[PDB]
Enzyme design. Structure first.
Site, PDB file in Angstrom:
ATOM      1  N   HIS A  46       0.820  -1.196   0.000  1.00 35.77           N
ATOM      2  CA  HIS A  46       0.000   0.000   0.000  1.00 35.77           C
ATOM      3  C   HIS A  46       0.856   1.249   0.000  1.00 35.77           C
ATOM      4  O   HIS A  46       1.957   1.236   0.515  1.00 35.77           O
ATOM      5  CB  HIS A  46      -0.825   0.131   1.273  1.00 35.77           C
ATOM      6  CG  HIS A  46      -1.575  -1.102   1.610  1.00 35.77           C
ATOM      7  ND1 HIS A  46      -1.332  -1.757   2.768  1.00 35.77           N
ATOM      8  CD2 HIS A  46      -2.507  -1.804   0.929  1.00 35.77           C
ATOM      9  CE1 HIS A  46      -2.118  -2.845   2.812  1.00 35.77           C
ATOM     10  NE2 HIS A  46      -2.839  -2.877   1.735  1.00 35.77           N
ATOM     11  N   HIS A  48       1.031   4.587   1.894  1.00 36.75           N
ATOM     12  CA  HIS A  48       0.535   5.224   3.135  1.00 36.75           C
ATOM     13  C   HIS A  48       0.683   6.739   2.991  1.00 36.75           C
ATOM     14  O   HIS A  48       1.449   7.243   2.160  1.00 36.75           O
ATOM     15  CB  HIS A  48       1.313   4.607   4.310  1.00 36.75           C
ATOM     16  CG  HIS A  48       0.876   3.221   4.655  1.00 36.75           C
ATOM     17  ND1 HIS A  48       0.246   2.951   5.841  1.00 36.75           N
ATOM     18  CD2 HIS A  48       0.915   2.060   3.960  1.00 36.75           C
ATOM     19  CE1 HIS A  48      -0.076   1.675   5.877  1.00 36.75           C
ATOM     20  NE2 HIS A  48       0.338   1.102   4.753  1.00 36.75           N
ATOM     21  N   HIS A  63      -3.446   4.332   5.311  1.00 39.48           N
ATOM     22  CA  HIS A  63      -3.345   4.273   3.862  1.00 39.48           C
ATOM     23  C   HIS A  63      -3.657   5.646   3.267  1.00 39.48           C
ATOM     24  O   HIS A  63      -4.454   6.413   3.825  1.00 39.48           O
ATOM     25  CB  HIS A  63      -4.401   3.303   3.308  1.00 39.48           C
ATOM     26  CG  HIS A  63      -4.181   1.889   3.692  1.00 39.48           C
ATOM     27  ND1 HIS A  63      -5.026   0.856   3.311  1.00 39.48           N
ATOM     28  CD2 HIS A  63      -3.191   1.316   4.414  1.00 39.48           C
ATOM     29  CE1 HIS A  63      -4.603  -0.274   3.863  1.00 39.48           C
ATOM     30  NE2 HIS A  63      -3.486  -0.036   4.503  1.00 39.48           N
ATOM     31  N   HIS A  71     -11.461   1.058   2.499  1.00 40.68           N
ATOM     32  CA  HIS A  71     -10.441   0.181   1.966  1.00 40.68           C
ATOM     33  C   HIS A  71     -11.017  -0.796   0.944  1.00 40.68           C
ATOM     34  O   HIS A  71     -12.058  -1.401   1.176  1.00 40.68           O
ATOM     35  CB  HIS A  71      -9.743  -0.559   3.115  1.00 40.68           C
ATOM     36  CG  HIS A  71      -8.649  -1.449   2.671  1.00 40.68           C
ATOM     37  ND1 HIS A  71      -7.435  -0.947   2.237  1.00 40.68           N
ATOM     38  CD2 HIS A  71      -8.588  -2.785   2.512  1.00 40.68           C
ATOM     39  CE1 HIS A  71      -6.632  -1.953   1.932  1.00 40.68           C
ATOM     40  NE2 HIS A  71      -7.353  -3.105   2.040  1.00 40.68           N
ATOM     41  N   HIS A  80      -9.083   3.027  -1.177  1.00 38.70           N
ATOM     42  CA  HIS A  80      -8.184   4.155  -0.988  1.00 38.70           C
ATOM     43  C   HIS A  80      -7.319   4.304  -2.233  1.00 38.70           C
ATOM     44  O   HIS A  80      -7.011   3.300  -2.877  1.00 38.70           O
ATOM     45  CB  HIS A  80      -7.270   3.803   0.198  1.00 38.70           C
ATOM     46  CG  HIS A  80      -8.014   3.508   1.462  1.00 38.70           C
ATOM     47  ND1 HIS A  80      -7.613   2.473   2.351  1.00 38.70           N
ATOM     48  CD2 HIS A  80      -9.103   4.145   2.003  1.00 38.70           C
ATOM     49  CE1 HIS A  80      -8.444   2.572   3.418  1.00 38.70           C
ATOM     50  NE2 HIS A  80      -9.377   3.568   3.224  1.00 38.70           N
ATOM     51  N   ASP A  83      -4.380   1.823  -2.211  1.00 38.76           N
ATOM     52  CA  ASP A  83      -4.630   0.379  -2.116  1.00 38.76           C
ATOM     53  C   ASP A  83      -4.118  -0.340  -3.366  1.00 38.76           C
ATOM     54  O   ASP A  83      -4.833  -0.393  -4.377  1.00 38.76           O
ATOM     55  CB  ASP A  83      -6.141   0.188  -1.983  1.00 38.76           C
ATOM     56  CG  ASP A  83      -6.641   0.542  -0.602  1.00 38.76           C
ATOM     57  OD1 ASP A  83      -5.814   0.692   0.303  1.00 38.76           O
ATOM     58  OD2 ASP A  83      -7.878   0.697  -0.421  1.00 38.76           O
TER      59      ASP A  83
HETATM   60 CL   LIG Z   1      -1.858  -0.485   8.009  1.00 38.71          CL
HETATM   61 ZN   LIG Z   2      -6.590   0.920   2.105  1.00 34.19          ZN
END
Ligand SMILES: [Cl-]
Ligand SMILES: [Zn+2]
Ligand SMILES: *[Se]c1ccccc1C(=O)NCc1ccc(OC)nc1
Ligand SMILES: *[Se]c1ccccc1C(=O)NCc1ccc(OC)nc1
Ligand SMILES: [Cl-]
Ligand SMILES: [Zn+2]
Lengths: 153, 153
Positions: A46, A48, A63, A71, A80, A83
């Protein structure tokens, strides 16, 4: 036309190099590279929100979610921005990463430059784990390695 | 207010945390933090063009120079955007950084997000060293520690 890169490292032996390339600002981003040191199977992957590694991977925050959505997996409309699903390690502990994504960007507003890329302990359930956390983190567990996403030549 | 951060690490003992904060668009950026493991004296301190740490600090490329100027000190008109001069380490090997600069930015074409901050082996002569390299690199020598400049909370 834009190239960005991220070196993944952490507290343990996981290490990786991930490249991102985007031909036009309006275009998909191709993501490629390799990560080694992983347990065989799926590892959540992911972007972040913060490019802050002050206290390790924890300081990267949640995220990257500029649109305040839940999510999901990369193929979902409900996801997100950060993602990117799972990478898969083989029995040798190597994940060869090959992703094309049209939600992240290297320009515009959904730009991932200066954010943190994280590879997680466990599989991301892509929001289908059957619990509350599934729709926030995907239950992918701790952060094995990370790095700040930077501009490349 | 925009906040960004950089964790400096390298092959030897040099390590640091540097914070950047910008209250207003196109306003000055405050830079603060600490670096340890240095030899006493001046150490060149620059934003380099690529946030590429794939091969350590060497992959960061030359000073960040979007305006195609020559190398200088932070108080010169003729300087690269990334020319932040020198940090000074004491006998303990610690540099306490406190800089305000009005050329770098945390938005726009002067933006340093996703680039690399480097602390160097030797003093930057601020383009006054009286050789050719002075107006390119400032003769600050090898790259002791570096990190990608990331978005902070
Ligand atoms: Cl996380
Ligand atoms: Zn996510
Ligand atoms: Se990333 C981003 C977000 C919002 C507006 C503009 C951008 C952007 O991409 N510009 C900065 C940039 C990024 C990459 C490169 O490398 C070729 N140069 C400038
Ligand atoms: Se400023 C810059 C340089 C290179 C790429 C992208 C950007 C950018 O402006 N990204 C978006 C951004 C910057 C800072 C913050 O702070 C909260 N959020 C988003
Ligand atoms: Cl240099
Ligand atoms: Zn310079």
């Amino acid at each position: 036309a834009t190239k960005v890169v991220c070196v993944l490292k952490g507290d343990g032996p996981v290490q990786g190099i991930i490249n991102f390339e985007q031909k036009e600002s309006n275009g998909p981003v191709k993501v490629w590279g390799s990560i080694k040191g992983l347990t065989e199977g799926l590892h959540g992957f992911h972007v972040h929100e913060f490019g802050d590694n002050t206290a390790g991977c924890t300081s990267a925050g949640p995220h990257f979610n500029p649109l305040s959505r839940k999510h999901g997996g990369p193929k979902d409309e409900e996801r997100h921005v950060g993602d990117l699903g799972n990478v898969t390690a083989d029995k040798d502990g190597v994940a060869d990463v090959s992703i094309e994504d049209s939600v992240i960007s290297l320009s515009g507003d959904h730009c991932i430059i200066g954010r943190t890329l994280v590879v997680h302990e466990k599989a991301d359930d892509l929001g289908k784990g059957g619990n509350e956390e599934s729709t926030k983190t995907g239950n992918a567990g701790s952060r094995l390695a990370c790095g700040v996403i930077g501009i490349a030549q």
